[PDB]
Design a protein around this ligand. Structure first.
Ligand SMILES: C[C@H](C[C@@H](C[C@H](C[C@@H](C[C@@H](CCN1CCCC1=O)N1CCCC1=O)N1CCCC1=O)N1CCCC1=O)N1CCCC1=O)N1CCCC1=O
Ligand SMILES: O=C(NCCc1ccncc1)c1[nH]c(Cc2ccccc2C(F)(F)F)nc(=O)c1O
Ligand SMILES: [Mn+2]
Ligand SMILES: [Mn+2]
Length: 180
């Protein structure tokens, strides 16, 4: 109670994104007032997912992140029973109707190579596409098929660096980076 991180989070991100992040953390037994770096992280991942689905065509993506566990798994079951895609063991973030595959979006404060290595080991199922962004401006996608336009990806990286600058100007960036 009283953290600068919580107030900055609720100020820097959009009210719907803050509400969704709060519902998610509470759904997973996590306190946004005590685990405030993770509050920021959930909000950032949520905004990156929304931006990512805003790129590309109109009907292209199905958003999985942001829903509650049960409804997200229901939509996943529908996607699988519709397209015949292998049911992912763990919840992805998006589904691409154009490339016909699930998408796992990563946002890390560490080296992108490491984070993708970790997430690729965790998923193991070599069917789901994996796309990592970084707060330094780096990105890395499975097969190096980055799915979206260059402009749409550049927008996301710019937003990430803006978040990083806003945290640094308030002296919460060191803690955020070392928290991962
Ligand atoms: C569809 C609805 C909410 C969506 C959330 C998502 C967020 C969207 C905000 C809107 C405004 N836009 C769209 C244009 C720009 C903008 O600002 N964007 C996109 C950019 C950043 C951002 O914030 N979108 C996309 C469609 C409209 C909408 O709101 N979500 C939340 C998780 C699942 C989902 O589909 N739903 C569906 C049922 C529950 C619910 O809440
Ligand atoms: O989907 C995700 N979580 C789904 C479950 C969940 C959602 C929101 N709140 C709590 C639970 C997800 N989580 C992360 C960060 C992370 C990584 C490993 C374990 C736990 C977490 C965290 F912080 F979320 F608990 N990075 C991603 O890229 C990503 O997709
Ligand atoms: Mn997710
Ligand atoms: Mn993700």
């Amino acid at each position: 109670r009283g953290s600068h991180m919580e107030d900055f989070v609720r100020q820097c991100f959009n009210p719907m994104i803050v509400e969704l992040a709060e519902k998610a953390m509470k759904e997973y037994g996590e306190d946004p007032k005590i685990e405030t770096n993770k509050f920021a992280a959930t909000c950032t991942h949520l905004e990156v997912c929304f931006m990512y689905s805003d790129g590309g065509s109109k009907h292209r993506f199905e958003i999985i992140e942001g829903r509650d566990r049960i409804m997200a798994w229901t939509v996943v079951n529908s996607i699988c029973n519709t397209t015949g895609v292998e049911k992912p063991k763990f919840l992805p973030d998006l589904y691409d109707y154009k490339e016909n595959r699930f998408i796992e979006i990563g946002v890390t404060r560490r080296e992108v190579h490491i984070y993708y290595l970790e997430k690729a080991n965790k998923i193991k199922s070599e069917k789901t596409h994996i796309h990592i962004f970084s707060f330094t401006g780096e990105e890395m996608a499975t097969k190096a098929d980055y799915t979206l336009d260059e402009e749409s990806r550049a927008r996301i990286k710019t937003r990430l660096f803006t978040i990083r600058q806003e945290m640094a100007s308030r002296s919460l960036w060191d803690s955020f980076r070392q928290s991962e």
